[PDB]
Amino acid sequence: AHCIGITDRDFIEGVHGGTWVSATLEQDKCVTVMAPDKPSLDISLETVAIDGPAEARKVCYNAVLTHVKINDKCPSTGEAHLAEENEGDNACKRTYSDRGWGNGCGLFGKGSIVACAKFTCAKSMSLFEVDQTKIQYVIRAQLHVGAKQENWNTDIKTLKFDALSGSQEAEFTGYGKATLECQVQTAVNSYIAEMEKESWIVDRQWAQDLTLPWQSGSGGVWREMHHLVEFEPPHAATIRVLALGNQEGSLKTALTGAMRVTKDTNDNNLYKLHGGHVSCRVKLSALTLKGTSYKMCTDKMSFVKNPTDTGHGTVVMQVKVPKGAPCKIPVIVADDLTAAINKGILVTVNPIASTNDDEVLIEVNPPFGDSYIIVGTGDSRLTYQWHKE
Amino acid sequence: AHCIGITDRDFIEGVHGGTWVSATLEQDKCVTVMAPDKPSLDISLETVAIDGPAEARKVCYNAVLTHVKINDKCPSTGEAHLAEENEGDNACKRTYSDRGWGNGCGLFGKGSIVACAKFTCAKSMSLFEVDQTKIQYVIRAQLHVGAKQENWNTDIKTLKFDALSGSQEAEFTGYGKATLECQVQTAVNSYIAEMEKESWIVDRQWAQDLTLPWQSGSGGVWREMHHLVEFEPPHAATIRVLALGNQEGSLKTALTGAMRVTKDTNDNNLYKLHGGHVSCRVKLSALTLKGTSYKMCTDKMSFVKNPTDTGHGTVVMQVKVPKGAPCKIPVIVADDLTAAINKGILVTVNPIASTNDDEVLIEVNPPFGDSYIIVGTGDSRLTYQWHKE
């Protein structure tokens, strides 16, 4: 029934003697499956997530340079050295400066000069390895029984899947069961990138080709520090060493193209992916209809919710049954008030009210142009003039 | 103007003294860019294709076995051999059969037996290497000038791009030029799969992991033939060797979840993709309006095409200008027939008729509720009552 709440909807129609149907589930899309003498089935792809992905890399986009050491030697006096050159947490550069009288050198020419700086990563981007098998995907399933919207969540059977989890059964008490054989499609060489609270799906080759300092799994060592370090041309005894600007903006700019990932609120290790699609095969032969034996409702009913357009070309209404329960709710969509031929298509197959004062939510597809929605019979019946554009 | 023909449309609005705007171009979607005193610009992603991709592999899904040779030797008489065992075009199997009196062997036990069959691939699937750089993407650009639909294709400037092709200029004679800095997003490693006329974008790892005979680039050798060959348990001197069924169905089934590729009709090497998106930055400051000097149309005009809803919340109409050309077409959307305050938003900025009997197509966004569409002035002006739901 939840497809009504969802903008993008598709109707799968089953042929009378068939047992299986095929459905493609995209995220933020819903599918209503209809089969003759079978209750209509709403199936939708909730989330496609990955739980506990191992961290492959870290990419510093904001670096801080501290304790800059510069050593120099007059021309023809040898190469200048620093102990930091041996220190792994230091980014260094060896070069020469113009020396002579004016900078305390007895000889005019190129004098040795070396600069080292302590590299500290202020802000880095995490890169996670996504295992195809560890991919978990959740599918919501529900029937068109006549439950009020406020109850939808409690009637929705949640089907949990992982890569090759096998067929999942959705058992509805009083309506039998439907079976789902789902396969997640690996169409969506990829890392899970994380910057602060924001997450994306990136290409591995692209991420490795980023001109930025990167750190291996478990860390302890920064490679390619020179990507965030700037050495200006040397003066006689000094070199201006500067940390490059925060590359957060450039990174985000490059990431604008990329698919985004919602990090789970409760769990710091769960990552809900968008974009992915699921190919499902549904067995309906095990589905049945409740209240087939029920006598038709003859008592005065009323519209709790007037017939309203769903935006799906269908109409929903909420009918109250104060008396006569348990009973079948007679619903047709005729050409006029005289004719008794149903021209409409009932999504809520065999609507029933098990108890008195029950409010049954009914969805129906009226024909094009002018028609009349008729609920029940006799003088007490409910009528509502309708027009389909 | 072509966005009108396209279902999914988006309106980009430029701020008065700004020069650049950002647009995201998805396939089967259009974007209308509007800037004050600038002609509205329709931009859309036509095709994202790859030209001349090198063939990496071939995957046989339908094999044919011919000329079956079987050699055998009685127990304790040595191993049985065939010349075909060294022939690369032959799939072979070595095993033993139960031998003794009844099959012409003086000894009861396991006798050597070997079977070879000429392997011929009836039908195979091609796999192409897709170069990120060789990716070409085409963008259609057009202005809202007032051209009839039948002429749209001739007014559309085609902007050809490839990975790092640089900014492309779209020059419209009499309306200046617009500039586009586009970047294709390499979210869509990957092979290009081909079966008969049908093509798809597949994952490399998935394709390599297929339990089927495969051939290298510049082929002449088939590897893993056993995937399509069946050797039945041996009889005394014979083995029933049979080719396995056409795996076309299984392949297509697996391919249902994958992105599809349209092979170009004219070119056998061009492959148009169905999934990528393009991030574009558009410069509009160089765009100008034609007929700013034109005097307003004062002659009796007529509606060739009555104002019609586009489904985009806008209205299109086709106005004939028999006399007065060259002239400005006065168009406003007022509260009534008396008021002269334009409450509507004109998509066709400064509509003009350069020649007599010109039929100008005009699009405008009327305000909500009741309004009046007014074209021209005087007693000969055109009026059309409108309502926005």
Author numbering:
A (entry chain B), B (entry chain A): 1 to 188, 192 to 392
Tell me what the authors wrote about this structure, in their words.
The mosquito-borne yellow fever virus (YFV) is prototypic of the Flavivirus genus, which also includes several human pathogenic viruses such as dengue virus (DENV), Zika virus (ZIKV), Japanese encephalitis virus (JEV), and tick-borne encephalitis virus (TBEV). Flaviviruses, which enter cells via receptor-mediated endocytosis, use protein E for this essential function. In infectious particles, E is primed to react to the mildly acidic pH of an endosome to undergo a fusogenic conformational change that drives the membrane fusion reaction. Protein E is a prototypic class II fusion protein, with three β-sheet-rich domains termed DI, DII, and DIII.
In the absence of pr, YFV sE remains monomeric at neutral pH but crystallizes as a head-to-tail dimer, as observed at the surface of flavivirus mature particles. We used the protein eluting in peak 5 for crystallization of the E dimer. The sE dimer structure, determined by molecular replacement and refined to a free R factor of ~27%, showed the same head-to-tail dimer conformation observed in the previously reported structure of YFV 17D sE dimer in complex with the antigen-binding fragment of the monoclonal antibody A5 (23). There are two main sE dimer interfaces, the first by the dimer axis and the second one involving the fusion loop, away from the dimer axis. The first interface involves an antiparallel interaction around helix αB, including inter-protomer hydrogen bonds, some of which involving main-chain/main-chain interactions. In the second interface, the fusion loop at the tip of DII packs against DI and DIII of the opposite protomer in the dimer for other flaviviruses. The side chain of the strictly conserved Trp101 of the fusion loop is covered by that of Lys308 of DIII, while the fusion loop main chain is partially tucked in between two short helices in DI, the N-terminal helical turn (N-helix in Fig. 6B) and a helix in the 150-loop (the 150-helix). Residues 149–155 form the 150-helix, highly exposed at the dimer surface. Superposition of DII of the YFV pr/sE complex on its counterpart on the sE dimer structure revealed a steric clash with the 150-helix, indicating that pr binding cannot take place with the 150-loop in the conformation observed in the sE dimer at neutral pH. Thus, it seems likely that the 150-loop of YFV will also adopt an alternative conformation at low pH, thereby promoting pr binding.
